[PDB]
A and B are shown apart, each in its own frame.
Chain A
Amino acid sequence: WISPELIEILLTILKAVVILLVVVTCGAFMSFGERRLLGLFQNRYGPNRVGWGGSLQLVADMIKMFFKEDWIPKFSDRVIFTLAPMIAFTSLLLAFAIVPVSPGWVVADLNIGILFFLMMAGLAVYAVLFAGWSSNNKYSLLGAMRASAQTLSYEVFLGLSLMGVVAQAGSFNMTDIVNSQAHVWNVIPQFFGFITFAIAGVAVCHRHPFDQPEAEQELADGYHIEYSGMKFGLFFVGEYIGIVTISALMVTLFFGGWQGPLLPPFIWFALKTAFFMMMFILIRASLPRPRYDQVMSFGWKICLPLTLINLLVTAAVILWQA
């Protein structure tokens, strides 16, 4: 196995494995950072006793989750019940598998890109649907119906929000998209696209204020009430990986990704991704949760025509300067 091509293949495989382990570890540490950042936002501390600064709280959480019993209810459909946390964990991971974190550091240099992210979101909704239906609980069924209504709300304009970025870059590849922002970042020309993609990406992960399927005040924790042990942890870890994936994708699509004046490119990418992660937590702490019929009306009557007009104006501007 002594050849430059084979060691290049091994190096690329090792880089992909490093990216995967780093993003999974970042999702778990992002759960811990959500606890700490909610404490910071709410004039408190959060966990700062388990080790120095609470750094071992995530380890104790993992040990407890692994040694909490994992059960499958007798009234549930066992195969779908076990299948749903796997989809919730893996769909947004595969969505992250196309994000370029640095020049020369990417898992898949697909020619579809944002199309693959749309595919993974449309596959990620089925995890919540399967969890809601399979557990055979009334609150879970209500949460699954709310999640389906939410997908009806957001998926109409989820791709049309980024079609302005695709039109400006002239391609579907993320590398071409971050290379098209060499002069100015895409948040300034595509600002309506920016806010519509922010709404749709918060709705993708079912994060607050869009936490309709799992609203504790409304449905008493919602669809995953029968889940426990490492399936419940799979749901939460997949949600946090989704947060990281949506933050990184928004950084690459609207803020240049790794492009920066002085710092190394990975430093800029990590800074902007952590900025949007703490913005996820700030959004959760800040604003209340709207009714899901109001969410559907806002996503259909407002966001979809906004994305259509933004795409038309972007096309006119592009063809004017061509």
Chain B
Amino acid sequence: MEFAFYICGLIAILATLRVITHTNPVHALLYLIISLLAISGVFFSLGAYFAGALEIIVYAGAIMVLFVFVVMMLNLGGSEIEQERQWLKPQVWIGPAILSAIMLVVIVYAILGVNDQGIDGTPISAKAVGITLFGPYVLAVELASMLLLAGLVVAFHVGREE
């Protein structure tokens, strides 16, 4: 169980790093799919089967429309990759790299300072998540439905051609 979690975590880290430092949009989307598959594998190793199930179910459709928009605008041959290459320079990425590194080491210092007892890996079924979702957490569900409705209304209002 440790092996699957650690291999999926390493794959997720590598695929995210390849995502943020790539010029090809379709290859970046493929590595993003790989990273989210690895994230769902991490979820499955921790016993949260529903979390990994929703990570593959709803993000396969999310990156699908990302592919649709990439085909819609970004694909132009080598010109788009060449234009994306000029925006990335050694100073340009070395600027915020040390900021991300110092933030990461501060958060790691924070993480290591807490007590630990180990994750037992006991599976949590979708039945318990459904009971808690429609039980103690009513208003989260209802106002999340209203939030998604609001986002849908915003998408309709902005995304019209004419």
Tell me if A40 is interfacial: C-beta within 8 Å of chain B: no
Give the Cβ gap from B1 to chain A, nearest Cβ, in Å. 16
Give the Cβ gap from B41 to chain A, nearest Cβ, in Å. 12
The answer to whether A119 touches B64, judged by C-beta atoms less than 8 angstroms apart, is: no
Known: A119-B60, A123-B56. A148 touches B68 (CB 8 A): yes
The answer to whether B71 touches A126, judged by C-beta atoms less than 8 angstroms apart, is: no
Tell me if B5 is interfacial: C-beta within 8 Å of chain A: no
The answer to whether B71 touches A112, judged by C-beta atoms less than 8 angstroms apart, is: no
The answer to whether B56 touches A122, judged by C-beta atoms less than 8 angstroms apart, is: yes
Tell me if B152 is interfacial: C-beta within 8 Å of chain A: no
Tell me if A276 is interfacial: C-beta within 8 Å of chain B: no
Contact size range, B: 20 to 34
The answer to whether A122 touches B71, judged by C-beta atoms less than 8 angstroms apart, is: no
Give the Cβ gap from A172 to chain B, nearest Cβ, in Å. 6
Tell me if A133 is interfacial: C-beta within 8 Å of chain B: yes
Tell me what chain B mostly uses at the interface: helix, strand, loop, or mixed.
helix
Known: A80-B26, A111-B123, A116-B53. A123 touches B67 (CB 8 A): no
Name the CB-closest residue of B to A166.
B126
Give the Cβ gap from A222 to chain B, nearest Cβ, in Å. 16
The answer to whether B49 touches A155, judged by C-beta atoms less than 8 angstroms apart, is: no
Give the Cβ gap from B131 to chain A, nearest Cβ, in Å. 12
Tell me if B21 is interfacial: C-beta within 8 Å of chain A: no
Determine which of A115, A126, A159 lies in contact with B64 in the assembled complex, contact meaning CB atoms within 8 Å.
A126
Interface residue ranges of A110-149 to B (CB < 8 Å)? 111-112, 115-116, 118-119, 122-123, 125-126, 129-130, 133, 141, 144-145, 148
Determine which of B27, B53, B60 lies in contact with A112 in the assembled complex, contact meaning CB atoms within 8 Å.
B53
Tell me if B89 is interfacial: C-beta within 8 Å of chain A: no
Determine which of B57, B65, B71, B127 lies in contact with A118 in the assembled complex, contact meaning CB atoms within 8 Å.
B57
Give the Cβ gap from B28 to chain A, nearest Cβ, in Å. 12
Tell me if B42 is interfacial: C-beta within 8 Å of chain A: no
The answer to whether B60 touches A122, judged by C-beta atoms less than 8 angstroms apart, is: yes
Known: A133-B71, A151-B64. A172 touches B126 (CB 8 A): yes
The answer to whether B71 touches A141, judged by C-beta atoms less than 8 angstroms apart, is: yes
Give the Cβ gap from B118 to chain A, nearest Cβ, in Å. 23
Tell me if B30 is interfacial: C-beta within 8 Å of chain A: yes
The answer to whether A125 touches B64, judged by C-beta atoms less than 8 angstroms apart, is: yes
Determine which of A80, A112, A119, A155 lies in contact with B126 in the assembled complex, contact meaning CB atoms within 8 Å.
A112
Size of interface on A: residues with Cβ below 8 Å to B? 24
Name the CB-closest residue of B to A147.
B64
The answer to whether A145 touches B126, judged by C-beta atoms less than 8 angstroms apart, is: no
B30, B57, B68, B75 pick with most chain A CB within 10 angstroms:
B57
The answer to whether B26 touches A115, judged by C-beta atoms less than 8 angstroms apart, is: no
The answer to whether B60 touches A115, judged by C-beta atoms less than 8 angstroms apart, is: no
Interface readout for B65-77 with A: 1 if CB under 8 Å, 0 if not?
Answer: 1011001000100
Determine which of A116, A126, A171 lies in contact with B33 in the assembled complex, contact meaning CB atoms within 8 Å.
A126
The answer to whether A111 touches B71, judged by C-beta atoms less than 8 angstroms apart, is: no
Determine which of B26, B53, B60, B125 lies in contact with A125 in the assembled complex, contact meaning CB atoms within 8 Å.
B60
Interface readout for B126-142 with A: 1 if CB under 8 Å, 0 if not?
Answer: 11000000000000000
Tell me if B90 is interfacial: C-beta within 8 Å of chain A: no
The answer to whether B61 touches A115, judged by C-beta atoms less than 8 angstroms apart, is: no
The answer to whether B127 touches A171, judged by C-beta atoms less than 8 angstroms apart, is: yes
Interface readout for B104-146 with A: 1 if CB under 8 Å, 0 if not?
Answer: 0000000000000000000101110000000000000000000
The CA-CA distance from A148 to B49 in the complex, in Å, is 28
The CA-CA distance from A111 to B127 in the complex, in Å, is 10
15 residue pairs from A and B, CB less than 8 Å apart? A80-B27, A111-B126, A112-B53, A115-B126, A123-B60, A125-B64, A126-B60, A129-B67, A133-B26, A144-B71, A145-B68, A148-B64, A148-B67, A148-B68, A171-B127
